[PDB]
Amino acid sequence: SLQTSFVTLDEAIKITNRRVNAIEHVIIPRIERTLAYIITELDEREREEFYRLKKIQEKKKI
Amino acid sequence: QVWPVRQVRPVTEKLPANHPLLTGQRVLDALFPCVQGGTTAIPGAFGCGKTVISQSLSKYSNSDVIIYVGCGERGNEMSEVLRDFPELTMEVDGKVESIMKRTALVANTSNMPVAAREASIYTGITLSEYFRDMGYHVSMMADSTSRWAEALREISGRLAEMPADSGYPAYLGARLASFYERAGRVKCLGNPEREGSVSIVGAVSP
Amino acid sequence: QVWPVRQVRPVTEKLPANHPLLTGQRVLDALFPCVQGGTTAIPGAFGCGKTVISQSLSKYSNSDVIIYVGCGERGNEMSEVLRDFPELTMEVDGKVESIMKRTALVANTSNMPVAAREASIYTGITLSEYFRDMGYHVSMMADSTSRWAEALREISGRLAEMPADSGYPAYLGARLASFYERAGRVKCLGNPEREGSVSIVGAVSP
Amino acid sequence: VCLFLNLANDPTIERIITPRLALTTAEFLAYQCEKHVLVILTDMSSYAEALREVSAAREEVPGRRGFPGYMYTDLATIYERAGRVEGRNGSITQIPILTMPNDDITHPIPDLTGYITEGQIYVDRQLHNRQIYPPINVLPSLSRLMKSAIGEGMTRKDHADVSNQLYACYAIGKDVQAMKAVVGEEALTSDDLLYLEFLQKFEKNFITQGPYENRTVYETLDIGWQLLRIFPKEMLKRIPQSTLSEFYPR
Numbered sequence: 001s002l003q004t005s006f007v008t009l010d011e012a013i014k015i016t017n018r019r020v021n022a023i024e025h026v027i028i029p030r031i032e033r034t035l036a037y038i039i040t041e042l043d044e045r046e047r048e049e050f051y052r053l054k055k056i057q058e059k060k061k062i
Numbered sequence: 063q064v065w066p067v068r069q070v071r072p073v074t075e076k077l078p079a080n081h082p083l084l085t086g087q088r089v090l091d092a093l094f095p096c097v098q099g100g101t102t103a104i105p106g107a108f109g110c111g112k113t114v115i116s117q118s119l120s121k122y123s124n125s126d127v128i129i130y131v132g133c134g135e136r137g138n139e140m141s142e143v144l145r146d147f148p149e150l151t152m153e154v155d156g157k158v159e160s161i162m163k164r165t166a167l168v169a170n171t172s173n174m175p176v177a178a179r180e181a182s183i184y185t186g187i188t189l190s191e192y193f194r195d196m197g198y199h200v201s202m203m204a205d206s207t208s209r210w211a212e213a214l215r216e217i218s219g220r221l222a223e224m225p226a227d228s229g230y231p232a233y234l235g236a237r238l239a240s241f242y243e244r245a246g247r248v249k250c251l252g253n254p255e256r257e258g259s260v261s262i263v264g265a266v267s268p
Numbered sequence: 269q270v271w272p273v274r275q276v277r278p279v280t281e282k283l284p285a286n287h288p289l290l291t292g293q294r295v296l297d298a299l300f301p302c303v304q305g306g307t308t309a310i311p312g313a314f315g316c317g318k319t320v321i322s323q324s325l326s327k328y329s330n331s332d333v334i335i336y337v338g339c340g341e342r343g344n345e346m347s348e349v350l351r352d353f354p355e356l357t358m359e360v361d362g363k364v365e366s367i368m369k370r371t372a373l374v375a376n377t378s379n380m381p382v383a384a385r386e387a388s389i390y391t392g393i394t395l396s397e398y399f400r401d402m403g404y405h406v407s408m409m410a411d412s413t414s415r416w417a418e419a420l421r422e423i424s425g426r427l428a429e430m431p432a433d434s435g436y437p438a439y440l441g442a443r444l445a446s447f448y449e450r451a452g453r454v455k456c457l458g459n460p461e462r463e464g465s466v467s468i469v470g471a472v473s474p
Numbered sequence: 475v476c477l478f479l480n481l482a483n484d485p486t487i488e489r490i491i492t493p494r495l496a497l498t499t500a501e502f503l504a505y506q507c508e509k510h511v512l513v514i515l516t517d518m519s520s521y522a523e524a525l526r527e528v529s530a531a532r533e534e535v536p537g538r539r540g541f542p543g544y545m546y547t548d549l550a551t552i553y554e555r556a557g558r559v560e561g562r563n564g565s566i567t568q569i570p571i572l573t574m575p576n577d578d579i580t581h582p583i584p585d586l587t588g589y590i591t592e593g594q595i596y597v598d599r600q601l602h603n604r605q606i607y608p609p610i611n612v613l614p615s616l617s618r619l620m621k622s623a624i625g626e627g628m629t630r631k632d633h634a635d636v637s638n639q640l641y642a643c644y645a646i647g648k649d650v651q652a653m654k655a656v657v658g659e660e661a662l663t664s665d666d667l668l669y670l671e672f673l674q675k676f677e678k679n680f681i682t683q684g685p686y687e688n689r690t691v692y693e694t695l696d697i698g699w700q701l702l703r704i705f706p707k708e709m710l711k712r713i714p715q716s717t718l719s720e721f722y723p724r
Contacts, residue, residue: 044538048225109616171554173555216544441520449482
């Protein structure tokens with residue numbers, strides 16, 4: 001009984017380890033890079049609108 | 063002859079495409095070919111060397127004339143084009159002739175002025191139409207029209223115009239559409255009943 | 269004598285920093301030493317302990333004067349250094365003495381109009397330079413660096429300037445260069461040929 | 475050696491002129507004095523910052539990251555003053571080094587600089603974190619004019635094939651390391667271990683050079699063949715057969 005359970009456990013151990021390693025190596029950096037890209041792009045777009053507002057008030061100076 | 067560049071030359075009646083364009087590359091021929099009359103794009107970041115594709119297509123084709131327009135590139139590429147194209151030769155009728163006897167080039171390096179970038183592309187397309195009015199098959203090729211768009215952005219910016227998106231003037235999309243429209247097979251205007259076509263391949267620098 | 273803030277007092281010549289800035293503890297004094305008259309960054313936040321290095325450089329170091337300059341400071345630090353003057357003494361000749369004599373405190377608390385809050389750093393560096401010209405050694409604690417960038421943003425708020433990055437004025441780099449560079453060891457300008465240096469320690473506050 | 479130093483004390487607007495002083499002196503020395511010239515332009519990022527400030531003084535139109543829209547044209551004006559000219563003998567070379575904020579290759583400055591230029595070297599942070607000098611990565615490095623620079627008559631016939639296959643093996647090894655970092659030892663194969671051994675030898679010998687040693691080109695090619703010898707000649711896809719016939723048995 002002891003050795004039967006012991007031979008069975010290893011496959012589950014390997015499955016769990018590969019899943020944890022994948023979650024630590026692939027999924028997280030990708031989403032982090034996307035978060036950086038999205039924040040910088042939104043900042044760019046707010047900036048473009050800001051420049052538009054700046055130039056209209058410049059013309060309104062006349 | 064003298065011709066206003068902006069105005070599109072007239073024609074008799076457009077015809078459908080019925081024959082492919084020979085491609086010097088294995089890929090994008092058996093998978094995604096371009097017809098003798100179609101329009102194409104070749105965008106991509108730097109490091110790919112789309113100029114390789116441009117030169118390879120220019121060297122090997124079944125067309126009668128070739129026109130290559132450079133806009134905002136390196137001078138090294140034009141040195142390559144001038145030095146190498148003379149040496150290559152092919153023939154169909156006996157004597158072995160150089161391929162620059164069927165090629166015409168327009169030149170604008172990146173250091174050149176700003177609006178000459180527009181002048182080059184418009185001169186090139188007008189020349190392509192004029193040679194199409196001889197009842198020939200002519201291919202055309204571009205180089206980083208995004209530089210042309212950038213030049214228009216700059217000039218319109220100094221004119222104090224509304225930017226539309228990313229700073230680019232609103233009418234650029236319409237300008238690009240009108241530029242790419244003048245192409246495809248067509249029946250020429252003349253009693254001799256000649257017939258020719260134009261193919262265009264355009265490059266973009268995102 | 270009176271000296272305008274926005275100019276650098278002259279020096280005969282600038283000598284390379286070739287000596288270590290002593291620190292109280294063997295940690296960060298044998299692993300990663302600093303150089304006398306150099307420029308250094310130290311991360312620091314609330315609760316971590318930032319006055320530990322301040323006091324260490326005030327008591328156990330080879331410098332000669334400490335000028336502590338910050339932004340949005342509290343009376344806690346003011347009274348703490350005031351009481352550390354008679355408590356945290358130094359037995360230079362076996363006798364304790366108030367470290368008030370070896371300090372000249374400068375600080376601004378939120379309230380202060382952003383002009384003065386931004387002028388504090390230049391007042392401090394001017395004072396440090398006036399003291400280094402006397403042939404001594406100095407350590408200028410450029411505390412509250414992130415708050416100082418905030419002060420730069422705040423002064424540019426009333427200028428309608430183009431946001432370089434999240435509101436940073438275009439001349440942010442100019443101000444960084446004009447501040448951090450005025451340091452090092454210099455041969456003084458006079459007959460008896462003194463020598464002295466100013467260090468700057470910009471406490472990073474991410 | 476002629477210097478045009480620009481200390482940080484100097485006014486910001488002064489930085490616009492200095493590169494053009496260097497380049498016009500270089501052009502004179504290269505097309506009037508008939509001398510080979512080498513140009514080094516340090517910290518183009520500071521020049522970009524100065525250009526941004528001068529442009530913002532007049533409230534001009536931005537592009538990405540608030541930089542001037544005509545920054546591409548300006549950088550082209552700076553860089554395109556290079557090459558060789560007919561009827562002369564001298565030349566001009568440029569090594570326009572720049573700084574790379576936050577290690578982002580999509581930032582406008584390095585992107586436009588790469589567009590105007592024809593290559594890159596990409597000094598690498600992780601190799602410097604392993605304390606190997608010079609820390610040079612080769613995965614992104616590009617010299618587009620190698621096509622005509624190399625070959626017999628300059629160095630040797632099979633230099634190009636050596637470079638191509640060595641690079642192919644390098645890329646395959648990096649992919650193998652990335653794949654091993656996830657799947658585990660049991661999901662590998664012997665070929666992967668051979669590529670890992672190649673990497674071991676490659677980074678630990680070929681890349682590491684030494685500050686003051688002037689290596690020789692043919693020594694580099696001999697070490698290249700040493701590295702290529704490791705694998706069976708059949709796996710060398712990107713080399714033609716005749717090169718293997720001439721050089722593999724050596």
